[PDB]
Structures are given as C-alpha cells and as structure tokens.
C-alpha cells in the first residue's frame, strides 16, 4: 500500500516585530531576509562535523571542495583543470567530492533562524531555512575569496559543502551578516 509520503510545500516565513528601526541588512535578516547573488558550483558530501574534524582538516576538506570544483567544473573564472581522477577526495576524511551540481544561479538568503538559497534559475528554494542545521562557511577575504562556500545539513547527504561562484563580495558580506545577525542572540558561554 501507499500510506503517506512527502508533501512538497516549503513555506514558513518568520514574522515578529519588536521594532523595525534596523539598518539595511539587519532589517531584512530580522524580517524577510537579505539576498546575495551566488552560483551553485559543485557539492562535496562531508560525513563529518567541526566537532569531529581537526583544525586544519576541517579547513582542508572545505577548501578541497572549493578547490577541485573550481579547478575542474564549469563556472570558475580561474581554473587550470587539475582533478585527481580515481583517488580519494583529500584523505577520505569526509564523504566524497560530487561535482554534479555546477552551473546553477542562486541567491544567498540570510534569516534570523534560516539560511536558505533561492534558485535564481526559477526552480525553487534550496538549502535549509534553519540556522541550527548548518556547519561551515568558507569566505571573508582569503585566498579563496573569489569562490565562496557553505557547509550545512544537506537535503540529500548528511552534510554537504556547497560552493558559490560569482560572489561579488558575498564572501565577507554573508559571513559578517549571518554571523552578526545570529550574534544578536550570541551568548559568550560558547564558541
């Protein structure tokens, strides 16, 4: 028989007004949510977490994704094409690099308890609208500032690193925005 399955309807906006006297980003992150232009470029399935990973290892596994992705899959503005064909991802520390989802326009949407990406491809909304279910985010202004990444609980895998192309500044922007947005209720007891 067939008794229940999945109802595919993702709709749940957070509405709460203590005030609206915020600044441009804050207004949205607390209300609708700020939006940045990003490009889905590859995805790496990581079966591990920061809790479980080494200080360099977690940076390596994240950069790995961004690395072999940008140096192999389409979208990257700078590649020399170097992929280890039949080998391990980095040290088989995580799952594996899956260069399948590359070349899809999306939108980094930051929200109080949500961090989802809207497919500008007019497909739908991806990622998860749940702050408590994220993990990594590579960005800021490093070597990799030209290619951004975020690792969260994946709709397919347990966790996945999703690399964003064409940041235009989204790197440091989303990092600062998401961080400081959540920081509005950030306790000093942890992190």
């Amino acid at each position: 028989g067939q008794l229940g399955g999945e109802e595919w309807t993702r709709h749940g906006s957070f509405v709460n007004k203590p005030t609206r006297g915020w600044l441009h980003p804050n207004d949205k992150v607390m209300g609708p949510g700020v939006s940045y232009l990003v490009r889905y470029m590859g995805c790496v399935e990581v079966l591990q977490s920061m809790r479980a990973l080494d200080f360099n290892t977690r940076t390596q596994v994240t950069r790995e994704a961004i690395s072999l992705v940008c140096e192999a899959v389409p979208g990257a503005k700078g590649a020399t094409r170097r992929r280890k064909p039949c080998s391990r991802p980095l040290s088989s520390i995580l799952g594996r690099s899956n260069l399948k989802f590359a070349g899809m326009p999306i939108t980094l949407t930051v929200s109080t308890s949500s961090l989802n990406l809207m497919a500008a491809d007019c497909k739908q909304i991806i990622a998860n609208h749940h702050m408590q279910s994220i993990s990594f985010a590579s960005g800021g202004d490093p070597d990799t500032a030209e290619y951004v990444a975020y690792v969260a609980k994946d709709p397919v895998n347990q966790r996945a690193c999703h690399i964003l192309e064409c940041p235009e500044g989204l790197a440091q922007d989303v990092i600062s925005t998401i961080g400081q947005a959540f920081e509005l209720r950030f306790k000093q007891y942890l992190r």
Partner: peptide
C-alpha cells in the same frame, strides 16, 4: 606525527577561512 596537513596536492590542500558561529560546534 606533525606535518601540517593530512595530505596535499593540486586537488586538495587547506587554504581559506571556513567557519560560522555556535550552531554545530563551538570552535
């Protein structure tokens, strides 16, 4: 053992800043 990384080559080496906040792991 003390190298620096677990392994490195054209595909894979650490080089970037990846983190978020206190959601999954207080690091």
């Amino acid at each position: 053992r003390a190298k620096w990384d677990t392994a490195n080559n054209p595909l894979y080496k650490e080089a970037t800043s990846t983190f978020t906040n206190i959601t999954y792991r207080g690091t």
